[PDB]
Design a protein around this ligand. Structure first.
Ligand SMILES: Cc1cc2nc3c(=O)[nH]c(=O)nc-3n(C[C@H](O)[C@H](O)[C@H](O)COP(=O)(O)O)c2cc1C
Lengths: 56, 429
């Protein structure tokens, strides 16, 4: 956060905890908004043999 | 008897297989044909049927059904409709050329067989359905039938027995499916060569809606010799329930391809190495052999080493006797390519009526082409096996079974080659 050391110390004392560690606002730890393309797997019935529907 | 596979020339039914004698009436009579035919007909249908049953004769068409009971199916009181005998001379099974020799070089034997069979089944006439490509053979058969008519052997008062009988030759038009009995009946009736659905069986409703019996050329031509020389003599050759003398066509990679009338239950190795000079390059160069044409699954060299050429022995060997067309492939043969070509043949010779046949045969053809190219995956072999099993038993004709069986045999006996070729294709790309 863009908070000065005096303000950070006052905030931590008033709260009683280290707020600068577990900040609620998200800055950079979020995942990227442009993720690589995926490749999802097929299910257990995507086989060319021994897969008659009467058995499942 | 214990060991079979050595027939003496005195016992061979077809004594003019190679056309080294006259194929006309004089030659046939000199070779024993038409002897005491009047007495055979005057014996009665029951006597002829009993002789056929005692001979242990089984169908030479490929089904191997007991001939005696099949013919006796027609032995019923007349219901006001005529009865016919139909001779299956289509001979479309790849590797099968035995009926061609019978028609071309021993035609009077076939005519006498038609007469005897019609007397046994009380058939008014006989429609011989010869292959359309067999035009010279059809001409020879027509000449023989004309000679029989002139001599009084057939026609009104056939051989003086008081039995009226006609023999008709109907040429084919180029359909392998017309080899099927019901499809042949449909072709004779003038429709498309699409097999019927049983029941009704031909013995009740057949050609023109009349009781009928379809039979192979060899099965009909061996009947006069069975009646004359005796059922016991015919049964004396071959194993029990596999009795008789069988015509064999030995094609493929053999030194001397030919056709010989050996005894049933002859060892396959003895048949190949004696009458054909063995496999090209020796018996140690034999990859696989198709024993019964194309509809029968292949067998590897290990099976071919000790196997008898009869119905039961080949049935135990996960194959069939069929038309006894021994296709021989050496170890230089692309077995996958050969099986793919057979499946392509079945694709091009499919009536296209039943859904499993029409769709699945083409599907398997495409899959086999991709296997030949190697452009597939190892998981597709079991898929192809399942497709073949879905085709087999679920069709109208047995052409579905006849197209599934080669694939099943290939998958059963050479799966490592398929997987290896798939690996080769994968590595190259
Ligand atoms: C696809 C197919 C092709 C056939 N081709 C022939 C053939 O060329 N010659 C033949 O005698 N039987 C052939 N058959 C068997 C016939 O349907 C019939 O069973 C046979 O002609 C009668 O044999 P049999 O009377 O000697 O027992 C074929 C069957 C099928 C399913």
């Amino acid at each position: 956060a863009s908070a000065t050391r005096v303000i950070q110390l006052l905030r931590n004392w008033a709260s009683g905890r280290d707020l600068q560690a577990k900040l609620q606002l998200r800055y950079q730890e979020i995942s990227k908004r442009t993720q690589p393309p995926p490749k999802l797997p097929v299910g257990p019935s995507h086989k060319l043999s021994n897969n008659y529907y009467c058995t499942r | 008897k214990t060991s079979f596979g050595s027939l003496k020339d005195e016992d061979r039914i077809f004594t003019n297989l190679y056309g080294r004698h006259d194929w006309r009436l004089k030659g046939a009579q000199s070779r024993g044909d038409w002897y005491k035919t009047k007495e055979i007909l005057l014996k009665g249908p029951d006597w002829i049927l009993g002789e056929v049953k005692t001979s242990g004769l089984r169908g030479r068409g490929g089904a191997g059904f007991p001939t005696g009971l099949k013919w006796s199916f027609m032995n019923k009181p007349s219901d006001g409709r005529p009865k016919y005998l139909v001779v299956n001379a289509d001979e479309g099974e790849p590797g099968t050329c035995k009926d061609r020799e019978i028609i071309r070089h021993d035609p009077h034997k076939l005519v006498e067989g038609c007469l005897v069979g019609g007397r046994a089944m009380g058939a008014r006439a006989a429609y011989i359905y010869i292959r359309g490509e067999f035009y010279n053979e059809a001409s020879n058969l027509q000449v023989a039938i004309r000679e029989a008519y002139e001599a009084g052997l057939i026609g009104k008062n056939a051989c003086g027995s008081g039995y009226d009988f006609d023999v008709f030759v109907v040429r084919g038009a180029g359909a392998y499916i017309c080899g099927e009995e019901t499809a042949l009946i449909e072709s004779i009736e003038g429709k498309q060569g699409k097999p019927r659905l049983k029941p009704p069986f031909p013995a009740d409703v057949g050609v023109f809606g009349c009781p009928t019996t379809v039979a192979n050329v060899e099965t009909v031509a061996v009947s006069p010799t069975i009646c004359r020389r005796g059922g016991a003599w015919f049964a004396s050759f071959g194993r029990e329930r596999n009795s008789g003398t069988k015509l064999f066509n030995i094609s493929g990679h053999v030194n001397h391809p030919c056709t010989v009338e050996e005894e049933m239950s002859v060892p396959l190795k003895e048949l190949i190495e004696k009458h054909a000079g063995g496999v090209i390059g020796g018996w140690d160069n034999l990859l696989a052999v198709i024993p019964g044409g194309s509809s029968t699954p292949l067998i590897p060299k290990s099976v071919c080493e000790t196997v008898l050429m009869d119905f039961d022995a080949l049935v135990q060997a996960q194959t069939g006797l069929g038309t006894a067309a021994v296709i021989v492939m050496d170890r230089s043969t692309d077995i996958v390519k050969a099986i793919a070509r057979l499946i392509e043949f079945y694709k091009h010779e499919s009536c296209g009526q039943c859904t499993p046949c029409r769709e699945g045969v083409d599907w398997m053809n495409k899959v086999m082409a991709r296997f030949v190219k190697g452009d597939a995956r190892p998981a597709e072999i079991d898929s192809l096996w399942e497709i073949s099993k879905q085709i087999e038993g679920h069709t109208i004709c047995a052409l579905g079974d006849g197209a599934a069986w080669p694939v099943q045999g290939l998958i059963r006996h050479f799966r490592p080659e398929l997987e290896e070729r798939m690996q080769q294709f994968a590595l190259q790309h």
